């Protein structure tokens, strides 16, 4: 039986198989592989796919002085060729983004170029706002700053 080991480790994330005569035999070889590489994840075996999953996220609970989340980011100098999916795809790399609001203003087709992106927590936004201030989505480095505005009035309707 060729068992698949799902390396969901902090060190690695890969897949491997061994021709094992038994699940107990397979898990040993997987344990060797995991232990040698340096992943100590929650051993969970799935019979359906015959896979051994070691889930190792490693977050702990010692680090947390955070307060408020759902921070919005402000991207400016934004190109009008930018689609909402575009920023969402980029920003989600820097942090856990929930949704993005790239306004589609047809009143000023060339005046204000801005968009908003809404992240999980400030922790996610910090990496994003700092990084993407100077990020090129196509032919423009976006002006990404932290937009901690309280209550979007949305009164920008011409």
From Swiss-Prot:
Disulfide bond sites: none
Modified residues (N6-acetyllysine): 109
Start and end residues of each RRM domain: 71-149
Induction annotation: Accumulates in a hypoacetylated/phosphorylated form in response to cisplatin treatment.
Subcellular location field: Nucleus; Nucleus, Nucleoplasm; Nucleus speckle
PTM (free text): Extensively phosphorylated on serine residues in the RS domain. Phosphorylated by SRPK2 and this causes its redistribution from the nuclear speckle to nucleoplasm and controls cell fate decision in response to cisplatin treatment. KAT5/TIP60 inhibits its phosphorylation by preventing SRPK2 nuclear translocation. Acetylation on Lys-109 by KAT5/TIP60 promotes its proteasomal degradation. This effect is counterbalanced by HDAC6, which positively controls SRSF2 protein level by deacetylating it and preventing its proteasomal degradation.
Phosphoserine modified-residue sites: 83
Residues carrying Phosphothreonine: 79, 82
Function description: Necessary for the splicing of pre-mRNA. It is required for formation of the earliest ATP-dependent splicing complex and interacts with spliceosomal components bound to both the 5'- and 3'-splice sites during spliceosome assembly. It also is required for ATP-dependent interactions of both U1 and U2 snRNPs with pre-mRNA. Interacts with other spliceosomal components, via the RS domains, to form a bridge between the 5'- and 3'-splice site binding components, U1 snRNP and U2AF. Binds to purine-rich RNA sequences, either 5'-AGSAGAGTA-3' (S=C or G) or 5'-GTTCGAGTA-3'.
Family membership: Belongs to the splicing factor SR family.
Subunit relationships: Interacts with BRDT. In vitro, self-associates and binds SRSF1/SFRS1 (ASF/SF2), SNRNP70 and U2AF1 but not U2AF2. Binds SREK1/SFRS12. Interacts with CCNL1 and CCNL2. Interacts with SCAF11. Interacts with ZRSR2/U2AF1-RS2. Interacts with CCDC55 (via C-terminus).
Protein name (database record): Serine/arginine-rich splicing factor 2
Shown chain mapped onto the complete sequence: 9 to 101 of 221
